[PDB]
Symmetry: C2
């Protein structure tokens, strides 16, 4: 499985930040970048400008959310077609921050996931359990439910990526923690999707930094990362990518 390092800028980044994007492009201009895929998910306000900056580079662009409809009376909401037409190849769906603060349900994320595929986008679908779900020993129940409710029947290794977010630690998770969450995801996805389940990229979406990337990304059934803060600066992001030097 080819690795993917995806950056989630969350609600950071304006015109000035585009330099970081260029530097990431530059850093992956060589042998390193030929070895992995990389996608940076920027705010919707920055996407077209970022698409221009990245024209002819290996680095892909994501949005951080999209609606389930193509268009309509939905003030303030962005369609996946809009993301597509502005230059996105990917969109993050079901991020913990939206499941929690925006109350997004598994059903909604499923509908967003189909609509994303219909617009030509790869869905980066996030799952993850809270501290109390974990303290209550329901971690796997919850991850399992999120995966079976958030993912539509038509998943392929090409149209869907899964990111695991240990929301519970928002504590640092152990290698052991990461290992057991990702083995569980892999077995869940194979049970439901068979062959292609084995090919779906599972990204680790906990706290990923240059200093912990080697240990976390060397874990079985981790196929990359959904990097938060460390993706805002090209030097951090590139040092995380350095992991796949070999």
């Amino acid at each position: 499985i080819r690795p993917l390092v995806a950056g989630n800028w969350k609600m950071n980044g304006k015109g000035e930040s585009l330099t970081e994007l260029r530097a990431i492009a530059a850093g992956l201009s060589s042998d390193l970048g030929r070895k992995l895929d990389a996608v940076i998910c920027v705010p919707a306000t920055l996407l077209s400008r970022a698409a221009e900056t990245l024209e002819g580079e290996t680095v892909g662009l994501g949005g951080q959310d999209a609606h389930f409809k193509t268009s309509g009376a939905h003030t303030g909401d962005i369609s996946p077609e809009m993301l597509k037409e502005a230059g996105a190849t990917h969109v993050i769906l079901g991020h913990s921050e939206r499941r929690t603060d925006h109350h997004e349900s598994n059903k909604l994320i499923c509908a967003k996931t189909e609509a994303a595929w219909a617009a030509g986008l790869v869905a980066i679908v996030c799952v993850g359990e809270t501290a109390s779900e974990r303290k209550a020993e329901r971690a796997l129940d919850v991850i399992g439910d999120q995966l079976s409710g958030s993912l539509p029947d038509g998943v392929t290794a090409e149209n869907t990526i899964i990111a695991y977010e240990p929301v519970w630690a928002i504590l640092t998770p152990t290698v052991q923690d990461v290992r057991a969450a990702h083995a569980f995801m892999r077995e869940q996805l194979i049970e439901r999707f068979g062959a292609k389940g084995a090919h779906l990229r599972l990204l680790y979406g906990g706290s990923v930094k240059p200093s912990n990337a080697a240990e976390l990304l060397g874990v079985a059934d981790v196929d990359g990362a959904l990097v938060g803060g460390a993706s805002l600066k090209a030097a951090d992001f590139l040092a995380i990518c350095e992991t796949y030097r070999n």
Copy 2:
């Protein structure tokens, strides 16, 4: 009070839509645009390109929502500074679609309005009662609670515009009467004067119900209506402009 026709594209608009902004700008190059302000509120994905499209022109640009913080861990949210830096001068906040479908409270909208101001944006803050609240005989009580709860203490006549949405009418095929509009706007004016004094007398109060080339003259002649927040009819330049032509004098 100088009138403002604002257009709300809602979740409509891509690169191909930019010619419409262009046509609107050109229609308002006449003697017309000297008399009124115009703002089109476009999807955040289009904002920077729409900014580029309208460079130099009188037509302002709006966002359709914005966060209450400047930045941070809010995956998929847009801060009012991102709108500002992309070229917007305005942002719609508290639209009924967001109050209903995104469960936005007065408290959230208040927090969003402060942040909009701190980013250098004029907040277009929407209020409006449902058919249920109307049948409860609480129309005015609802609009009053929304205005008091949604608006921060720092309102100025320059940093805030209010738009009234007759949400009750949506989906019914009936359009509010001049009597309905007058009563809502007279009420909003009195409330804003009680709370903000003379600032409250100069606040622009936009009519955000169904406004189309066919009804614009009557509705926009209503006392205490200082313009409109136009929906569907802002999607096509000729419709938007025919609403604006109501103000030719």
